[PDB]
Amino acid sequence: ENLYFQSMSVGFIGAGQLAFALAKGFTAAGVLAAHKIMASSPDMDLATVSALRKMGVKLTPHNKETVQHSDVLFLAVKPHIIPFILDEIGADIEDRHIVVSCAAGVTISSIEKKLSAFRPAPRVIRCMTNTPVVVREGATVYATGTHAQVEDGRLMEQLLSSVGFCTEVEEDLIDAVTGLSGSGPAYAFTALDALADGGVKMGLPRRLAVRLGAQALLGAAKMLLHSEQHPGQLKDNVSSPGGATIHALHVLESGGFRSLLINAVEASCIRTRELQSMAD
Amino acid sequence: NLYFQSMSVGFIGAGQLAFALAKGFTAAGVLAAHKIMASSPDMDLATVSALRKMGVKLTPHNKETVQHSDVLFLAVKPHIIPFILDEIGADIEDRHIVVSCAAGVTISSIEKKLSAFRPAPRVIRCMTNTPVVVREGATVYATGTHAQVEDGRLMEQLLSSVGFCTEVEEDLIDAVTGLSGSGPAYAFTALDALADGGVKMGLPRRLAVRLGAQALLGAAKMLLHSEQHPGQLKDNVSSPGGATIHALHVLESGGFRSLLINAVEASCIRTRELQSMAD
Amino acid sequence: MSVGFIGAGQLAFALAKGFTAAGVLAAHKIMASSPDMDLATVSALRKMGVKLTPHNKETVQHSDVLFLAVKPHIIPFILDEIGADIEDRHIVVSCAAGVTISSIEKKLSAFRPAPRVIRCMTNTPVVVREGATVYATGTHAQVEDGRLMEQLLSSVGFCTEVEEDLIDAVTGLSGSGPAYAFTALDALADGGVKMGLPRRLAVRLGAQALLGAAKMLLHSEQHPGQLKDNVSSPGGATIHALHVLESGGFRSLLINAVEASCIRTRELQSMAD
Amino acid sequence: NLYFQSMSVGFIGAGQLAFALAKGFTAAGVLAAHKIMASSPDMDLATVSALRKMGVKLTPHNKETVQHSDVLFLAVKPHIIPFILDEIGADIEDRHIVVSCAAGVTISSIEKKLSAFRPAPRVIRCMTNTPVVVREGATVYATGTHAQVEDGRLMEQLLSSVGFCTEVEEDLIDAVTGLSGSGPAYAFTALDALADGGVKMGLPRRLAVRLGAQALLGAAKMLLHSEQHPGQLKDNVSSPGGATIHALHVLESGGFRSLLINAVEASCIRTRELQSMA
Amino acid sequence: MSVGFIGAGQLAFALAKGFTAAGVLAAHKIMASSPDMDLATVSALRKMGVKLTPHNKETVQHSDVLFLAVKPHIIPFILDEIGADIEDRHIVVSCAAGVTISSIEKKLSAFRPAPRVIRCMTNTPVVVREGATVYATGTHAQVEDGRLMEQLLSSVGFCTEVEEDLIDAVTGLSGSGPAYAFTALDALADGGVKMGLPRRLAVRLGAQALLGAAKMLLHSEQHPGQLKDNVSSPGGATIHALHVLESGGFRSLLINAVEASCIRTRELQSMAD
Ligand SMILES: O=C(O)c1ccc2[nH]c(=O)[nH]c(=O)c2c1
Ligand SMILES: O=C(O)c1ccc2[nH]c(=O)[nH]c(=O)c2c1
Ligand SMILES: O=C(O)c1ccc2[nH]c(=O)[nH]c(=O)c2c1
Ligand SMILES: O=C(O)c1ccc2[nH]c(=O)[nH]c(=O)c2c1
Ligand SMILES: O=C(O)c1ccc2[nH]c(=O)[nH]c(=O)c2c1
């Protein structure tokens, strides 16, 4: 509302799944006109690029053009690409820019070190988000850089709140957030596929089983978000004595279900830390 | 702009699912709380204490609920159902729609007990879940022998106000129980574990719970709004060599998918057992 | 166009058989050299019509496109043997797993500047013209070099250009993939035999099943999970079998395999460098 | 080809298998799409939409499919078969060849139900799979008590147009179900996982899927065109100390082979159960 | 002495090849009958010099010792086909797994009293004269019948008489044993290849290792655990490898195998009876 009237220009360096998801989310939110977004990519024959083209997002092979168009500039490329990108358009970053890095593991310090060689006070924000911004139910955290104004963090929270949950964190939490909510949707998609397989095994049509499993997970997550109760307490409320649910919970426990999800968060976090160590 | 002006709803049993439906129904604005009555043997229940605050009428006597109500939800444990039907069978009238939410309990068994008192009882079997309390439930129903077409349409309209609702053949309901009946508990277990993972890697517990729940909510919503297979949506998250595909490997190495299949199967089989013992 | 092979083991035979079955090369325009002129793969190229020789230098002098079909540990010795013989006309195509374009160009540049080098990763089903091939172009490979290589290798299966840093991963997937499939086919046949089928029939049916599913996926726009959903009737035989695969961590074993083959390929080159 | 000259085909059931066979048949040029009729209890399915696109005639009444068909494919679940035989049984004539594709359902059970209407029903039992849609199916069939010599011949020619087809004794069919009936789902599972492995090691998903499918297709063709044992072909692929033999070890360490045996066995046993129940 | 085979699959070929290699029977004094006169095992007996025929009755009329080398589910049909043709002179030797002497004698006694029946459990290495055979004598088998059978089958490997109730267990051990060994040899060769040996050499060395160890044990009075102790030098390579076998439950897998083959053999006969 107030952000739409700001008439912001947004740029994405990188035109893959995350850039498409955010562009789709921002336009569905009405905070940005699609034609006020510009995206660049070295490979213009990607499917995500054609989807962005149909939305009306401006597309170019030239990262400099994205930079010059943009007020808020998202870096949506892989971690090992970031230093080459900063070398290439570092001279084109202006005082008016806010540079938002979405690269997993890449530290504000490494970005500011590159950019400060060109102009002395680059405004940098580090972001970690996920694909459900496309349905305006993302989970986003951000940390502000050395030179990011207080108004810069409030602007970014306003923008990212339009497509889901958003909150400021200290940067040292972001690798862990990556393993939880960055990778989280993929754990859920895996779980939903498996639950549907279970529904089909027990005689449900696939379409119904997918719908029911997804509705179950959505409702449960919303319950927890609207409850101040522990998830174990909500689990207890579901499970009647001797009943169907408690029998199913036992077979999950017998396979170490809980430990697998802990293993997943840890593995994603650890990999995020070693992608940056390979950079560093 | 739905509102059932001439419908009175009663709950026999005042436990978790009764409160959840009454809360969902009232939050939806389709029923005034004062047109809902609930009966319970343990009037010191925490759920029976909350229903009073909403304005739901409470009574200790199942006969009062039956006499007050047109739509009668049977929200009791499965083994109590034949004792309930023995109690109020002679009080069932033509106007009544009896909606059983008892897991596993067949329409045939309910109709056989009620038909000893008055022929043609109108019976609908329901399987729903606790997220109706936030109007995001997953409900299926099957109509009995003597249920009229308007009965099912009315129940679907009512249960659609608190989440997804669709008609199914009765022999699918034990499997629905294993999937969406028990599913929220699988999700609560997963969210506790994901939060433990976040805490292990250094996040505060409160933030970890919030992020994990938001992640699951968003992913579920994506799937419901997409025509794409969940495997395609999974593919879009995982960048080559990246954090997510490394985490997906450790889920696979533990047989994560098989445990969720095991769970649906175990809940379904137990539902079939509970009934085969009722017979 | 004349083609030569340094090395005459399994992969050299598979390419030459595929190329000539494709009609893109005449067998008499192909030359192959081997140290052990007693390998069974050597006698097969003989019956095929390929010109044979023990001298690596003869192959170089007779061919324009030069395939290096030797084990990765022998490439430096081959380059040191023939490096003085490479000319402006030669396109050197290394099929050795792990071996970098950099390492080939370094050895050859000591003899003549700007060697034209291509790195290729292919697999044995080129012998039935259904291989899977990727290639990366070297520093001095001209534009027509890559296009020529794609034209040649597309005649024996799928072929596409990649950045060289993907090739070790390709090795773990389609380079080693046929071996995973042969293992799977042996095991599926054992399962058919356990359940009462004659071995010959069980082999034929399992192989046909795998061929048809692979073709379905290549010819469909749909995700393999969606095609899986279409096979599995509710409550049926297939979804019961898929559960027992999942319970054993079937998917993770295949991920483990691609990872292990890729990592070993990286080790083999690190030991070379 | 004079077998298929004036032949009309009907599918009772409009699910995934009826669609796959109708697509395969029309793609093969054996039958014309308009000469094919299908019936379903729910004309609002996903597959019934595609069949309408192809030009196949659709109806909600199975009696209409029977009266319009020479070769009648029963493409429904095994528990529905006795209900369908009760429904259309009085309409089966001496001209009809009844082809059951239901898993586990025995020729004897079908003949018993149809013999109450007319005494010599011509029955064939079939087990095929979804890759008939690209004419690379794997099909077996067994002929019933009253199937004429030309009947199995016609069936052989029809199903060979869409892939491999051979006659078997009926007592092998449950085992074939576990192997080539369910087989494609094992392959799709394996291809999804192999692509995940490629992605973990840095490949784009689209490329990883293409390479994995091509690897599987090429290996399968190699074995079909070779007289050699699959273990021999495996040995030819594995260079000493190399990448492939290292990957084969980790497959062996997880019992990869036993999982595929388990799968064939579980599918076969479920097929026997579905019949022993119904 | 004239010998016949009803059945001409793997086991019939192995016995006939072993017998004639042993010099105890002339190939022209051997007759074999099969329904599928197109099996590869049938053409091998042809090249060997064995007289072939499709008619089970011809084999019976031409031979004195009559081997039943058919699958266990076909024995009753064979007995019903030829039972009227058995005479005083015939010794009927059933090699079908699980099939009891009782069931054979019951079917044959309906035609002529006192049929002379032997039950045998052998294995494929009779083809190289290193088989393992046990036999049990029937109710009406004379004393010279057992001694003759031991003389014949000792020419193609180890042979001893047993009580019939041990034969299902023997089936699980030496009947199925060669298959366990072939599996073990394939896996040991894979291990040699992983560690850098060429496949042909790894197969030869692994097979020689197994042959020599088996011969050591047969020729020694010592317990296999004691011979194991003699191989394993303290701190050495062998004792490290034995630990990893133990950690995987190697011994229990072999016990599982003998048990599973024995139990299945009992099931197959229970289904027959
Ligand atoms: O590589 C991955 O698995 C992955 C997952 C989520 C992510 N979310 C985000 O905001 N930036 C990222 O790079 C990102 C990467
Ligand atoms: O025992 C349980 O865990 C359980 C779970 C979900 C349920 N949903 C419903 O509608 N009625 C029920 O009894 C029910 C019971
Ligand atoms: O040793 C191996 O496991 C192996 C497998 C496939 C290969 N394909 C190719 O093109 N060059 C290679 O060296 C190669 C090696
Ligand atoms: O139950 C199943 O999963 C299944 C799988 C493959 C099949 N192929 C066929 O031809 N008829 C079938 O019923 C069939 C059923
Ligand atoms: O089917 C089997 O696994 C098997 C193995 C060994 C055998 N040895 C013998 O003498 N008669 C048999 O039937 C036999 C059967």
DSSP for C136-152 reads EE-SS--HHHHHHHHHH
Question: Is the separation of the CB atoms in E159 and E46 below 8 Å?
Answer: no
Alpha-carbon distances, residue B99 vs B93, B170, C148 (angstroms): 14, 13, 73
SS (H, E, C) D23-91: HHHHHHCCCCHHHEEEECCCCCCHHHHHHHHHCCEEECCHHHHHHHCCEEEECCCCCCHHHHHHHHHHH
| Count of C-beta atoms within a 10 Å radius of residue E236 | 10
Q: Touching check for B119 and chain D: CB below 8 Å?
A: no
Establish, for the pair of chains C and D, how many residue pairs have beta carbons separated by less than 8 Å. Answer: 436
E122 lines ligand 5 (CB under 6 A): yes
Q: Residues of B marked as binding for NADP(+)?
A: 12-17, 40, 62, 75-78, 101-103
Q: Which two tokens stand for residue E261?
A: 């083959």
Breaks (C-N over 2.5 A) in chain E follow: none
Q: Which two tokens stand for residue C75?
A: 């490439």
Q: Please name the residue that has the structure tokens 């030359």.
A: C31
Give, as one character, the DSSP assignment of residue E122. Answer: -
Kindly calculate the radius of gyration of chain D based on its CA atoms and give it in whole angstroms. 21
Strands D122-127 and D137-143 turn out to be: antiparallel
Coil, helix or strand for A240? coil
Beta-bridged to residue D71, according to DSSP, are D9, D97
| Count of C-beta atoms within a 10 Å radius of residue C87 | 11
Beta-bridged to residue A98, according to DSSP, are A72, A123
Report the atom number in ligand 5 closest to the C-alpha of E175. 6
Side chain identity at C144, as an amino acid letter?
A: E
Q: How far is C-alpha E156 from the chain's CA centre?
A: 10
Categorise residue D241: left if φ over 0, alpha if ψ from -120 to 50, beta otherwise. left
Gap between the Cα atoms of C213 and A169, Å rounded? 48
Coil, helix or strand for E32? strand
Cβ separation B229–C222 shorter than 8 A? yes
Across the interface, of D188, D223, D249, the residue whose CB is closest to C207 is D223
Gap between the Cα atoms of C28 and C52, Å rounded? 10
- Identify the burial level of A162 via C-beta atoms within 10 angstroms of its C-beta, where 0-12 means exposed, 13-18 middle and 19 or more buried: buried
Give, as one character, the DSSP assignment of residue E222. Answer: S
Gap between the Cα atoms of D42 and D34, Å rounded? 20
Kindly calculate the radius of gyration of chain E based on its CA atoms and give it in whole angstroms. 21
Resolution (angstroms) stands at 1.7
Gap between the Cα atoms of A32 and A16, Å rounded? 19
> Ligand nearest A239 Cα, by number?
2
DSSP D175-230: HHIIIIITHHHHHHHHHHHHHHHHHHTT--HHHHHHHHHHHHHHHHHHHHT--S-H
Breaks (C-N over 2.5 A) in chain A follow: none
Q: Which two tokens stand for residue D237?
A: 């692929």
Q: Which two tokens stand for residue E221?
A: 């009075």
Contacts of B221 (CB under 8 A, 6+ apart): A132, A135, A137, A218
Report the atom number in ligand 3 closest to the C-alpha of C133. 10
DSSP B198-211: HHHTT--HHHHHHH
Q: Which two tokens stand for residue A125?
A: 């924000």
Beta-bridged to residue D97, according to DSSP, are D71, D122
Gap between the Cα atoms of A34 and A4, Å rounded? 12
Distance from B276 to chain C by nearest Cα, in Å? 20
Q: D170: closest CA among D79, D108, D82?
A: D108
DSSP C153-213: HHTTEEEEE--GGGHHHHIIIIITHHHHHHHHHHHHHHHHHHTT--HHHHHHHHHHHHHHH
Coil, helix or strand for E68? strand
Q: Which two tokens stand for residue E9?
A: 């699959």
Distance from D194 to chain B by nearest Cα, in Å? 11
Question: Is the separation of the CB atoms in A168 and A220 below 8 Å?
Answer: no
Question: Is the separation of the CB atoms in D125 and D155 below 8 Å?
Answer: no
Please report how the helices C224-231 and D183-200 are oriented relative to each other, as an axis angle in degrees rounded to 10. 160
Q: Touching check for A201 and chain C: CB below 8 Å?
A: yes
If one residue of D80, D158, D177, D270 were mutated to test the ligand 4 pocket, choosing by the most ligand atoms within 8 A of its CB, it would be: D177
In chain D, what residues touch B167 (CB-CB under 8 Å)? none
Q: Which two tokens stand for residue D42?
A: 């729910």
Question: Is the separation of the CB atoms in C88 and C82 below 8 Å?
Answer: no
Coil, helix or strand for A194? helix
Beta-bridged to residue D139, according to DSSP, are D165
* Cα–ligand 5 centroid distance for E123 (angstroms): 7
Nearest C-alpha in C relative to B232: C223
Q: Please name the residue that has the structure tokens 């395939």.
A: C67
Where are the strands (E) in A159-241, listed by range? Answer: 164-168
Q: D181: closest CA among C157, A246, C205?
A: C205
Across the interface, of D192, D200, D203, the residue whose CB is closest to B246 is D200
Q: Touching check for B254 and chain C: CB below 8 Å?
A: yes
| Count of C-beta atoms within a 10 Å radius of residue E254 | 14
Q: Which two tokens stand for residue A151?
A: 């108004």
Question: Is the separation of the CB atoms in D138 and D183 below 8 Å?
Answer: yes
Evaluated on CA atoms D130, D135, D137, D139, the torsion sign reads positive
Contacts of B34 (CB under 8 A, 6+ apart): B55, B56, B57
Contacts of A172 (CB under 8 A, 6+ apart): B202
Please report how the helices C177-194 and D205-224 are oriented relative to each other, as an axis angle in degrees rounded to 10. 60
Q: Which two tokens stand for residue E211?
A: 């042959």
| Count of C-beta atoms within a 10 Å radius of residue E260 | 12
Tell me the backbone φ, ψ of residue A168, rounded to 5 degrees. -80, 140
Coil, helix or strand for A14? coil
Question: Is the separation of the CB atoms in C70 and C12 below 8 Å?
Answer: no
Alpha-carbon distances, residue A63 vs A13, A42, A67, A167 (angstroms): 6, 9, 6, 29
Gap between the Cα atoms of B47 and B53, Å rounded? 10
Q: Which two tokens stand for residue C165?
A: 């840093």
The experimental method behind these coordinates is X-ray
* Cα–ligand 4 centroid distance for A209 (angstroms): 20
Contacts of A50 (CB under 8 A, 6+ apart): none
Give, as one character, the DSSP assignment of residue A33. Answer: -
Alpha-carbon distances, residue C94 vs C103, C250, D239, E140 (angstroms): 11, 34, 16, 74
- Identify the burial level of B8 via C-beta atoms within 10 angstroms of its C-beta, where 0-12 means exposed, 13-18 middle and 19 or more buried: middle
SS (H, E, C) A105-141: CCCHHHHHHHHHCCCCCCEEEEEECCHHHHHCCEEEE
> How big is the CA angle at B136 (ends B131 and B138), to the nearest 5 degrees?
75
| Count of C-beta atoms within a 10 Å radius of residue B106 | 21
Q: How far is C-alpha C204 from the chain's CA centre?
A: 24
Interface of D with C in 17-76 (CB under 8 A): none
Question: Is the separation of the CB atoms in D9 and D71 below 8 Å?
Answer: yes
Gap between the Cα atoms of D234 and D238, Å rounded? 6
Cβ separation A202–C232 shorter than 8 A? no
Q: B267: closest CA among A200, A253, A248, A250?
A: A248
Gap between the Cα atoms of D267 and C191, Å rounded? 11
In chain C, what residues touch B235 (CB-CB under 8 Å)? 223
Q: D51: closest CA among D65, D64, D36, D62?
A: D36
DSSP B5-61: TT--EEEES-SHHHHHHHHHHHHHTSS-GGGEEEE-S-TT-HHHHHHHHHT-EEES-
- Give the torsion through C-alpha atoms of A145, A150, A153, A157, to 10 deg: 170
Gap between the Cα atoms of B35 and E23, Å rounded? 102
Gap between the Cα atoms of E16 and E29, Å rounded? 10
Gap between the Cα atoms of C4 and C12, Å rounded? 9
Strands E157-161 and D71-74 turn out to be: unpaired
Kindly calculate the radius of gyration of chain C based on its CA atoms and give it in whole angstroms. 21
Alpha-carbon distances, residue A84 vs A77, A78, A81, A87, D32 (angstroms): 11, 11, 6, 5, 59
Give, as one character, the DSSP assignment of residue B177. Answer: I
- Give the torsion through C-alpha atoms of D71, D74, D75, D77, to 10 deg: -170
Distance from D128 to chain B by nearest Cα, in Å? 25
| Count of C-beta atoms within a 10 Å radius of residue B149 | 8
Q: Which two tokens stand for residue A13?
A: 């360096």
- Closest C-alpha residue for ligand 5 atom 7: E175
Gap between the Cα atoms of C167 and C174, Å rounded? 10
Gap between the Cα atoms of C16 and E227, Å rounded? 51
Gap between the Cα atoms of B155 and B78, Å rounded? 21
Gap between the Cα atoms of C158 and C168, Å rounded? 18
B267 lines ligand 2 (CB under 6 A): no
Nearest C-alpha in C relative to B253: C252
Strands C91-94 and E157-161 turn out to be: unpaired
Query: Do the annotations mark residue A95 as ligand-binding?
Result: no
Strands A10-13 and A37-40 turn out to be: parallel
Give, as one character, the DSSP assignment of residue D134. Answer: G
| Residue-level length of chain C | 273
Across the interface, of C225, C243, C248, the residue whose CB is closest to B261 is C243
* Cα–ligand 2 centroid distance for A189 (angstroms): 25
Question: Is the separation of the CB atoms in D37 and D72 below 8 Å?
Answer: no
Alpha-carbon distances, residue D34 vs B153, D48, D52, D58 (angstroms): 39, 14, 10, 10
Report the atom number in ligand 4 closest to the C-alpha of D127. 10
Alpha-carbon distances, residue C267 vs A180, C73, C178 (angstroms): 32, 12, 21
The beta-carbon contacts of A22-26 under 8 Å, at least 24 apart in sequence, are A22/A74, A22/A76, A22/A129, A22/A133, A22/A163, A23/A52, A23/A55, A23/A57, A24/A55, A24/A133, A24/A134, A25/A133, A25/A134, A25/A135, A25/A136, A25/A138, A25/A162, A25/A163, A25/A164, A26/A159, A26/A162, A26/A163
